[PDB]
């Protein structure tokens, strides 16, 4: 008759997990290499996916922490003394403008909350509430997008969470300054409904529930084959 | 309970291609509880584990401190243990597994292109 407090939904699902690692440069190059983008979802990290897909419906708040580490870049014309690096982190709600390049107008939109962060301080954090039209997120959706019974199968538009975009505020004239971003994601005030059997087959697609047939368990020698045995000894005489 | 304070002091390294102007050095300190993943190299995945509390510290501030509670399965630490690890009366003598406290791992957050910084 010992405690069960560690098996509750809160203590089971509120563990921070690293869900994205990206890199971006601070100088000339291909524009797509000068910013980092991520669409918020729980279907790309298999370890977190297996935990969220024990329940059919979920309702939680998001807490996102960004760890940013920058270093100098080898080449010619190295910077002898740089003041400090500042980074801009922008959260785009569902339906907001999304940048197609760095130094775009969407970076200065008043509907997108942004964080300006200087090197040396504590990691930046933000919290997003339960932002959806429906009354819950749904891990499994059996249905179509249009009512013609045709379209994308298994896609629901009621569980969009937005995007995260990170770039360098500074304009650098001497040298390049590569930076690396890590995203830590955590649910809070979690509520879950309608439990489901955990998955057996390995994941094959982030968008689908497709699978390969897998054996229901691990093989055994015989039906009456108990595990191994013990040799004769002082107790067994 | 354990209270641990870390004093970190950095200096430039002699050689060629000395850094003319570096912004600041940041250090990562990670405490690994008993049974958690332990890095086998720098820039490993265990450095980004969500079960290992970490401190990110910038040069110039006050020394970093952490406090660990009484983390053990039993009800006390034991300085002297007369017994074995296995019940076969064989194994390592004098070793108890009930007084593990974890590990501490420290590394440089920054990636340095010009010079070395011991």
């Amino acid at each position, epitope marked *: 008759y010992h405690s069960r407090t560690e098996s509750s939904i809160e203590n089971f699902l509120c563990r921070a997990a690293c869900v994205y690692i990206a890199t971006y440069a601070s100088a000339g190059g291909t524009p797509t290499e000068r910013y980092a983008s991520w669409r918020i979802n729980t279907r790309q990290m298999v370890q977190l996916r297996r935990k969220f897909e024990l329940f059919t419906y979920l309702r939680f708040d998001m807490e996102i922490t960004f760890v940013i580490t920058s270093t100098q870049d080898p080449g010619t014309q190295l910077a002898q003394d740089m003041p400090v690096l500042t980074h801009q982190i922008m959260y785009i709600p569902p339906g907001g403008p999304v940048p197609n390049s760095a130094t775009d107008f969407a970076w200065q939109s008043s509907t997108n909350p942004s964080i300006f962060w200087t090197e040396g301080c504590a990691p930046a954090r933000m919290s997003v509430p339960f932002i959806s039209i429906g009354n819950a997120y749904s891990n499994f959706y059996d249905g179509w997008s249009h009512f013609t019974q045709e379209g994308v199968y298994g896609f629901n538009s009621l569980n969009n969470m937005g995007h995260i975009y990170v770039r360098h505020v500074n304009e650098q004239s001497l040298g390049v300054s590569t930076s690396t971003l890590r995203v830590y994601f955590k649910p809070k005030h979690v509520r879950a409904w309608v439990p489901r059997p955990p998955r057996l087959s390995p994941y094959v697609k982030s968008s689908n529930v497709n699978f390969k047939p897998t054996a229901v368990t691990t093989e055994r020698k015989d039906i009456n084959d108990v595990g191994t045995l013990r*040799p*004769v000894g*002082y107790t067994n005489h | 309970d354990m209270e641990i304070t870390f004093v970190i002091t950095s200096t430039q390294d002699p050689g060629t291609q000395l850094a003319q102007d570096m912004p600041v050095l940041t250090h990562q300190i990670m405490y690994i509880p008993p049974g958690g993943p332990v890095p086998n190299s720098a820039t490993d995945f265990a450095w980004q584990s969500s079960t290992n509390p970490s401190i990110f510290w910038t040069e110039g501030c006050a020394p970093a401190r952490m406090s660990v509670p009484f983390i053990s399965i039993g009800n006390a630490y034991s300085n002297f243990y007369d017994g074995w690890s*296995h019940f*076969t009366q064989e194994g390592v003598y004098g070793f108890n597994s009930l007084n593990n406290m974890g590990h501490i791992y420290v590394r440089h957050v920054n990636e340095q292109s010009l010079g070395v910084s011991t």
Partner: antibody, heavy 117, light 114 residues
């Protein structure tokens, strides 16, 4: 007239474990398995009995604290372990089996344990 | 019942040639807690009492000449003699003392080739 076999004679070394097995062709209910010591200098001396269906193992006082016995009834193989092995313990170990409480009916085949140091 | 199979035939080789033999066991003979292999290679002079060569498959019996070396881990069990002799005529078994019963091997005569 049932045959009887064993693990076999192997040239061992001093202080090296030598297990002398013994096959079976009977059941394991209230019967007995044991051995002897066949050395012309030392004559014949028993080493220890094993009793299937009784869970009893005994050793002689001449080897008590030195030798141990074990067996697996299902596997049909009986062990006779030995420790602190000497060089003069070499003998033609005979596997004796009794299907009765008090008798000696079937004898073994013969195995040698002579070593060279 | 747990038994073990020796080589299909005898050595049937010349005198003075190193011989290698194996004993195929029908089940595992390693106790993982102690890492001990419960099997021994036996030797019975015709007409006298038998006597093994090496017990535990890694500890040669005291008094046994250095020619016999027993090996083999897990189900397999082997033995090697770097100098076969004409006066070592016997029947070679690979007996197991792991669990009841203590079953013997299959037999191996030292025949004549000269």
């Amino acid at each position: 007239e049932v045959q009887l076999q064993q693990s076999g004679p192997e040239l061992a070394r001093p202080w090296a474990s030598v297990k002398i097995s013994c096959q079976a062709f009977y059941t394991f209910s209230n019967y007995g398995m044991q051995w002897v010591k066949q050395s012309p200098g030392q004559g014949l001396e028993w080493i220890g009995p094993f009793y299937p269906g009784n869970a009893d193992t005994s050793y002689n006082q001449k080897f008590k604290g030195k030798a141990t016995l074990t067996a697996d009834k299902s596997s049909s193989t009986a062990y006779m372990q030995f420790s602190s092995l000497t060089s003069e313990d070499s003998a033609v170990y005979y596997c004796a089996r009794v299907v009765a409480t008090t008798d000696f009916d079937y004898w073994g085949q013969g195995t040698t344990v002579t070593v060279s140091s | 019942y747990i038994e073990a199979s020796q080589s299909p035939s005898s050595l049937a080789v010349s005198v003075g040639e190193k011989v290698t033999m194996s004993c195929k066991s029908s089940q595992s003979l390693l106790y993982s807690s102690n890492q001990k292999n419960y099997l021994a290679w036996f030797q019975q002079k015709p007409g006298q009492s038998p006597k093994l060569l090496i017990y535990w498959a890694s500890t040669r019996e005291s008094g046994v000449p250095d020619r016999f070396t027993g090996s083999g881990s897990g189900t397999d069990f082997t033995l090697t003699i770097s100098s076969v002799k004409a006066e070592d005529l016997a029947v070679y078994y690979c007996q197991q003392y792991y669990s009841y019963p203590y079953t013997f091997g299959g037999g191996t005569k030292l025949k004549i080739k000269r």
